[PDB]
Design a protein around this ligand. Structure first.
Ligand SMILES: *[C@@H]1O[C@H](CO)[C@@H](O[C@@H]2O[C@H](CO)[C@@H](O[C@@H]3O[C@H](CO)[C@@H](O)[C@H](O[C@H]4O[C@H](CO)[C@@H](O)[C@H](O)[C@@H]4O[C@H]4O[C@H](CO)[C@@H](O)[C@H](O)[C@@H]4O)[C@@H]3O)[C@H](O)[C@H]2NC(C)=O)[C@H](O)[C@H]1NC(C)=O
Ligand SMILES: *[C@@H]1O[C@H](CO)[C@@H](O[C@@H]2O[C@H](CO)[C@@H](O[C@@H]3O[C@H](CO[C@H]4O[C@H](CO)[C@@H](O)[C@H](O)[C@@H]4O)[C@@H](O)[C@H](O)[C@@H]3O)[C@H](O)[C@H]2NC(C)=O)[C@H](O)[C@H]1NC(C)=O
Ligand SMILES: *[C@@H]1O[C@H](CO[C@@H]2O[C@@H](C)[C@@H](O)[C@@H](O)[C@@H]2O)[C@@H](O[C@@H]2O[C@H](CO)[C@@H](O)[C@H](O)[C@H]2NC(C)=O)[C@H](O)[C@H]1NC(C)=O
Ligand SMILES: *[C@@H]1O[C@H](CO)[C@@H](O[C@@H]2O[C@H](CO)[C@@H](O)[C@H](O)[C@H]2NC(C)=O)[C@H](O)[C@H]1NC(C)=O
Ligand SMILES: *[C@@H]1O[C@H](CO)[C@@H](O[C@@H]2O[C@H](CO)[C@@H](O)[C@H](O)[C@H]2NC(C)=O)[C@H](O)[C@H]1NC(C)=O
Ligand SMILES: *[C@@H]1O[C@H](CO)[C@@H](O[C@@H]2O[C@H](CO)[C@@H](O)[C@H](O)[C@H]2NC(C)=O)[C@H](O)[C@H]1NC(C)=O
Ligand SMILES: *[C@@H]1O[C@H](CO)[C@@H](O[C@@H]2O[C@H](CO)[C@@H](O)[C@H](O)[C@H]2NC(C)=O)[C@H](O)[C@H]1NC(C)=O
Ligand SMILES: *[C@@H]1O[C@H](CO)[C@@H](O[C@@H]2O[C@H](CO)[C@@H](O)[C@H](O)[C@H]2NC(C)=O)[C@H](O)[C@H]1NC(C)=O
Ligand SMILES: *[C@@H]1O[C@H](CO)[C@@H](O[C@@H]2O[C@H](CO)[C@@H](O)[C@H](O)[C@H]2NC(C)=O)[C@H](O)[C@H]1NC(C)=O
Ligand SMILES: *[C@@H]1O[C@H](CO)[C@@H](O[C@@H]2O[C@H](CO)[C@@H](O)[C@H](O)[C@H]2NC(C)=O)[C@H](O)[C@H]1NC(C)=O
Ligand SMILES: *[C@@H]1O[C@H](CO)[C@@H](O[C@@H]2O[C@H](CO)[C@@H](O)[C@H](O)[C@H]2NC(C)=O)[C@H](O)[C@H]1NC(C)=O
Ligand SMILES: *[C@@H]1O[C@H](CO)[C@@H](O[C@@H]2O[C@H](CO)[C@@H](O)[C@H](O)[C@H]2NC(C)=O)[C@H](O)[C@H]1NC(C)=O
Ligand SMILES: *[C@@H]1O[C@H](CO)[C@@H](O[C@@H]2O[C@H](CO)[C@@H](O)[C@H](O)[C@H]2NC(C)=O)[C@H](O)[C@H]1NC(C)=O
Ligand SMILES: *[C@@H]1O[C@H](CO)[C@@H](O[C@@H]2O[C@H](CO)[C@@H](O)[C@H](O)[C@H]2NC(C)=O)[C@H](O)[C@H]1NC(C)=O
Ligand SMILES: *[C@@H]1O[C@H](CO)[C@@H](O[C@@H]2O[C@H](CO)[C@@H](O)[C@H](O)[C@H]2NC(C)=O)[C@H](O)[C@H]1NC(C)=O
Ligand SMILES: *[C@@H]1O[C@H](CO)[C@@H](O)[C@H](O)[C@H]1NC(C)=O
Ligand SMILES: *[C@@H]1O[C@H](CO)[C@@H](O)[C@H](O)[C@H]1NC(C)=O
Ligand SMILES: *[C@@H]1O[C@H](CO)[C@@H](O)[C@H](O)[C@H]1NC(C)=O
Ligand SMILES: *[C@@H]1O[C@H](CO)[C@@H](O)[C@H](O)[C@H]1NC(C)=O
Ligand SMILES: *[C@@H]1O[C@H](CO)[C@@H](O)[C@H](O)[C@H]1NC(C)=O
Ligand SMILES: *[C@@H]1O[C@H](CO)[C@@H](O)[C@H](O)[C@H]1NC(C)=O
Ligand SMILES: *[C@@H]1O[C@H](CO)[C@@H](O)[C@H](O)[C@H]1NC(C)=O
Ligand SMILES: *[C@@H]1O[C@H](CO)[C@@H](O)[C@H](O)[C@H]1NC(C)=O
Ligand SMILES: *[C@@H]1O[C@H](CO)[C@@H](O)[C@H](O)[C@H]1NC(C)=O
Ligand SMILES: *[C@@H]1O[C@H](CO)[C@@H](O)[C@H](O)[C@H]1NC(C)=O
Ligand SMILES: *[C@@H]1O[C@H](CO)[C@@H](O)[C@H](O)[C@H]1NC(C)=O
Lengths: 191, 142, 143, 191, 143, 191
């Protein structure tokens, strides 16, 4: 409506998808699948599931770096994800393959003051739009955040136009960059 | 440090907004950008300007945005919006913004973000006091 | 990354936010000045007290929330500036005993600026009285 | 008291104890003993003493993370402490134990330009109110501060009325919390 | 987070800080624009040199001090943004030379701004004097 | 010769050599052989050459921390440089030589988006002001810098009359101070 007879309310919605060849775009598909997209050809897929894809507890990070067949941007996003997570103490709760340049990671997720709170916190900060539907706690729950799903899987996929229930939104990743080294426990004497 | 990137009056092409309008803003709106820090708009303007400059003035890597994030945007504004999200305070996911258009001469204020809650854009009557405050501030033209 | 936190209630300090004294309510002009001014410690303490209040009310013992939100709720270089002053044996501020100037006739209130400390003891009024006079000279221009 | 016949001077002695629950409060007791209080019924007791308690060179950090018996907030504070040291290279100095969920750390100290300078500087920045009495000279020297005490032993403790001399002040902890990883010496080619 | 360092009383540049000039001293007034503006390059150099001055006088080799004070003294993101200009072909600033409009009669000087650099040499007045015209219009706007 | 009648345009050139004592400076005297000075009689030399000096691929850097002989400021600058290399993912493409406090850190530089690109980006950004001549890249190929030379070397040196080609400029080092630990690839789960 017109305010003070002369001042009308007119709105503008930003077409956030047009930042696609410059920086990552995070969007949702449903309560499970949340798609991060680096460019217009490749991206990451974050899925909370009760079914696992990696059945072993090893993680060949150093050998993956030595061989170096993976994509640099996807590994950069996964590094930002794993560094941003708070109070990560149980090394056994993560697995990864990186087999022949693959990207697959699996955070074991099976209460308050556990690693699941950090995993879901990083997940909702990354994919901001779907946090309403991915999270079972509703609103007002911060410390004791914990979902019903038993694993958080990360894979690499292409762009099949899977952004539904939320528009492209780089706000999560861009905001999460500054959270990279805010909270990590010391792991050894010599840094 | 603080954001420092300057805007190359800024008009947003039809590509970078919905409904396909020029939405050319006045010089005063861009003038407010440099001083004000805690306003969600003038943050996306820097991102879109940097987008255009990077596309046109450089011949797919996310290292550039990693370098330039803190120089471009106020990350802690995004953090304030997230803190509003977790506390069940209405917040802004940087999607839709609103300005007061003066139809007599076409001058418009710097747009403020449309707050959200429970997966829905907030009712315009809920924050109408802020709209009246923006009207009153805009009446102080001289 | 700049401070980004609103204040709501002219913010008025309650009984539990200051020792043996009554509520100290300030005009909205001081809060509007806090919105713009960066190198001010009392505005940061207002932000911290507001954040604590909202933490008790809107949330229900970890310290991770502030561990993330420190850069939003503290200017974070006023502490560095005061530390740099302290190591150099210069007067500094330890964020206590803030002073202001309230008008008895009208009830108007200034923006509280910190009371400097040196040598591990509170710094006398005469030593920085010219700063108080500069604040008063600025405030007569507010007419 | 009246200034210029128009305005009068006043004071605001803030109560920092209201901020107990939100973040840690760092206070002093005397030259040796300084304290950090996290919420209530828990906190750290950082003391400078000549009598060692650990008297061994190991530091069970990875095992403590695996067992996960410690308290998360105190471990976060100690991680912020250790990372905040400007130049830590001698890993033999630090010696810690967390047997059965305990928390205790010991920074061994012994012309200038040694790790004790960094340890004592971060100690001052932690106990930032009223800790000037630790040194023989509390002025004219910051880069080469030395103390007569041989060990800095950090311990967890209950919540008694330890605070004395300086009053509670969360400013020091938040000051450290920004400078966590601003100056760390590399130890590995791959980070 | 945000720059916060404040000047020392006199602050103005001297022969220890200029190349050729001798005691090119500003009036120490109408320089609080630095406290308001954050895109200015000359302001960061003023604060950095003032910090160096106190570093020589106050304290007595180690570069820990600048490592701690880099965020308190200078807007590092302005360095990042001018470096981003350096990546592109746009004119940039390398923090060396500055320009200011000095009034003739009263002698007041504007806040200095960096002389932009392109092709390894300083810019000509054409394509850049429009900024000088806007600055002069700002000076006429002062009253 | 005045703008708007009553304004003289007086120029101001600023001398950054005055800041030599309390903070590092950087300069250039060749296409190769760029320089950093901590104070007088102490600095690092970024010799960007085509012949190696350290064929030994073993860095042995923790042992350098064990025998504390290296200068702390020089090691701090080395850590700032190495931590500021974007997406560093090959430990093999780096060599060191610490012996009696000596510092001699080599970066091998032998497609678009390799380790050499990150090394050269951080090298330009440290020695900004006179690094344009060093690297053959143009203006719009920042994603990957190609250079005919094949090795970068960082060596401690006493300060002679260097800085011949470029003026001293501390801007690059202060820029890299914010760059530390911002873009690092995860290599261990616990960090
Ligand atoms: C920021 O960017 C700008 C523009 O890119 C830079 O400005 C230029 O910087 C260079 C280097 O500082 C400067 O070149 C000098 O010009 C001086 C003019 O007085 C010269 O004196 C200086 O050295 C020469 O003269 C000395 C004697 O005074 C000689 O001893 C010295 O060897 C040089 O002599 C030349 O000629 C003799 C003749 O025999 C020869 O033997 C020598 O080898 C040499 O060829 C430099 O030549 C430019 O003048 C600057 N341009 C301007 C307009 O200022 C600025 O440096 C950058 N700033 C930062 C901090 O990055
Ligand atoms: C940066 O490096 C310098 C060297 O390591 C540090 O020392 C400084 O050296 C400069 C040299 O100029 C001192 O500046 C002044 O030097 C003049 C000497 O020239 C005079 O004599 C000639 C001939 O008559 C005359 O033409 C000149 O006008 C001068 O009168 C002295 O007169 C001045 O008093 C002054 O010393 C610096 O003062 C000196 N700094 C100190 C005290 O350490 C320098 O320290 C490093 N940067 C800083 C300043 O921290
Ligand atoms: C670099 O170190 C290697 C390996 O030495 C081991 O790791 C060091 C960090 C330290 O902890 C040592 O005590 C360890 O043994 C050195 O390799 C040795 O080189 C010597 C001399 O040529 C040779 O006789 C030994 O057999 C080698 N041992 C092994 C296990 O490879 C190497 O010399 C060091 N290089 C330097 C200092 O340049
Ligand atoms: C984001 O994707 C959009 C399409 O959804 C791209 O828009 C096109 O951009 C090109 C230049 O890259 C223009 O020539 C076209 O006119 C644009 N429109 C269409 C329909 O193709 C856009 O470029 C992509 N990314 C960025 C960073 O702008
Ligand atoms: C993921 O976590 C689950 C839950 O901890 C792991 O399964 C349990 O492992 C513990 C520890 O050995 C056993 O005591 C439980 O009996 C296991 N539960 C079940 C149902 O088998 C599981 O192994 C982890 N890894 C994967 C790949 O799922
Ligand atoms: C995934 O598994 C979880 C965990 O079992 C299921 O949620 C409930 O889990 C509790 C115990 O924590 C059981 O008592 C409930 O019966 C489970 N609910 C069921 C089986 O509906 C969760 O439902 C599973 N989700 C999916 C999609 O299979
Ligand atoms: C995820 O990344 C992997 C690794 O790059 C891709 O796997 C390759 O896919 C191509 C194209 O089909 C094949 O030619 C290669 O043989 C595959 N390599 C390996 C090691 O599996 C994969 O296609 C990407 N996408 C998805 C959806 O997994
Ligand atoms: C910001 O939040 C709003 C409110 O939840 C989102 O608006 C919805 O966006 C979806 C995108 O597919 C539309 O289908 C809905 O119709 C929108 N709802 C309304 C009420 O208009 C918006 O997408 C979010 N934007 C971002 C960038 O995250
Ligand atoms: C700020 O510094 C002053 C001066 O050291 C402190 O004032 C002392 O406070 C204690 C504790 O309340 C009193 O017992 C002393 O009598 C005070 N001394 C003086 C000279 O007034 C003050 O506590 C410090 N504040 C903080 C938060 O650290
Ligand atoms: C810790 O902080 C809380 C506030 O966060 C203090 O709680 C208040 O204590 C006063 C004591 O007079 C009561 O009147 C208030 O009603 C309390 N408020 C709440 C929300 O509990 C508590 O006293 C502080 N305790 C200490 C000393 O740590
Ligand atoms: C702290 O370190 C010092 C050396 O800096 C240690 O002192 C030496 O300890 C060893 C081992 O017991 C003895 O052989 C030496 O004689 C000791 N030297 C001196 C001068 O006392 C000291 O033991 C360490 N203390 C700890 C770890 O508690
Ligand atoms: C530090 O924390 C540890 C672990 O919580 C405490 O140790 C326990 O103390 C309680 C109370 O006396 C006992 O019930 C437990 O059996 C203790 N066991 C173990 C294995 O630690 C310790 O008391 C705390 N430190 C202090 C000084 O109270
Ligand atoms: C701006 O102009 C004024 C006046 O021309 C300059 O002030 C003079 O500075 C010189 C320095 O040697 C003195 O000798 C004169 O006495 C000054 N005159 C007056 C009236 O101030 C001023 O220096 C110029 N701007 C600068 C360089 O700061
Ligand atoms: C480096 O510069 C410093 C600072 O000017 C010089 O320090 C002087 O060193 C001499 C001995 O060489 C001492 O006697 C003086 O007391 C020192 N001066 C001050 C002010 O402390 C140092 O000499 C210079 N070194 C070189 C190699 O030029
Ligand atoms: C720097 O990298 C180059 C390329 O990897 C290395 O060159 C290789 O050196 C090894 C060991 O001598 C040879 O087996 C390879 O065949 C070489 N490859 C080529 C194509 O030259 C070089 O050795 C590395 N650094 C050093 C120490 O020279
Ligand atoms: C989300 O969409 C994917 C698309 O493949 C589907 O497999 C999955 O079951 C969906 N989940 C829900 C809860 O609808
Ligand atoms: C992505 O955009 C580029 C722009 O050059 C285009 O060449 C390419 O075909 C696009 N990719 C896909 C999968 O459509
Ligand atoms: C304001 O309304 C006028 C009406 O003529 C329109 O032309 C103009 O584009 C509007 N401005 C904005 C910024 O939406
Ligand atoms: C918002 O609140 C309404 C009731 O007021 C509820 O039906 C709805 O589900 C809520 N939305 C979310 C996302 O929790
Ligand atoms: C507020 O939202 C309702 C739906 O809840 C919508 O119909 C209405 O138009 C909005 N308010 C006004 C005053 O239009
Ligand atoms: C100043 O004095 C008046 C006198 O009525 C008092 O009410 C007021 O609280 C005092 N100051 C402030 C800041 O409120
Ligand atoms: C300093 O303050 C004390 C407070 O007791 C007072 O006695 C003394 O006179 C003051 N001195 C000066 C010079 O103002
Ligand atoms: C400091 O106080 C503690 C309280 O337990 C006491 O044990 C210790 O001896 C005191 N230290 C000094 C130096 O007075
Ligand atoms: C600690 O705080 C809690 C808050 O619920 C309170 O119930 C408890 O009594 C407090 N403990 C002590 C010893 O005061
Ligand atoms: C550019 O060149 C003109 C002469 O062609 C000269 O007058 C002007 O001052 C130059 N601009 C500068 C100072 O770079
Ligand atoms: C400069 O480069 C040449 C080769 O172009 C080299 O021979 C010379 O030694 C270098 N100068 C210095 C001072 O190192």
């Amino acid at each position: 409506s017109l305010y003070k007879g002369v001042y009308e309310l007119q709105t503008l919605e930003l077409n956030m998808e047009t930042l696609n060849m410059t920086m990552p775009l995070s969007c949702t598909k449903n309560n499970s699948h949340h798609y991060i997209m680096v460019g217009n050809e490749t991206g990451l897929e974050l899925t909370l599931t009760n079914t696992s894809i990696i059945n072993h507890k090893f993680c060949n990070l150093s050998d993956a770096h030595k061989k170096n067949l993976y994509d640099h941007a996807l590994m950069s996003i996964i590094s930002t994800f794993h560094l941003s997570i708070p109070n990560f103490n149980q090394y056994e709760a993560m697995s990864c393959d990186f087999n022949g340049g693959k990207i697959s990671v699996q955070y074991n997720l099976s209460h308050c003051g556990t690693v699941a709170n950090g995993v879901l916190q990083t997940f909702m900060r990354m994919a901001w739009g779907g946090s309403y539907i991915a999270l079972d706690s509703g609103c007002g729950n911060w410390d004791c955040i914990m979902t019903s799903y038993q694993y958080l899987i990360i894979q690499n996929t292409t762009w099949e136009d899977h952004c539904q229930f939320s528009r492209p939104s780089p706000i999560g990743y861009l905001g999460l960059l500054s959270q990279r080294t805010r909270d990590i426990y010391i792991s050894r004497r010599l840094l | 440090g603080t954001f420092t990137w300057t805007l190359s009056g800024y008009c947003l092409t039809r590509w970078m907004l919905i409904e396909a309008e020029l939405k050319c803003f006045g010089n005063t709106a861009v003038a407010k950008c440099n001083e004000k820090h805690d306003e969600e708009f003038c943050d996306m303007l820097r991102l879109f300007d940097f987008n255009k400059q990077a596309i046109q003035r450089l011949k797919m890597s996310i290292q550039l945005i990693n370098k330039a994030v803190n120089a471009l945007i106020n990350d802690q504004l995004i953090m304030k919006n997230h803190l509003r999200d977790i506390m069940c305070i209405p917040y802004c996911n940087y999607s839709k913004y609103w300005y007061l258009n003066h139809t007599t001469t076409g001058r418009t204020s710097l747009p403020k973000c449309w707050l959200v809650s429970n997966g829905s854009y907030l009712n315009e009557t809920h924050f109408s006091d802020d709209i009246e405050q923006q009207a009153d501030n805009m009446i102080t033209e001289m």
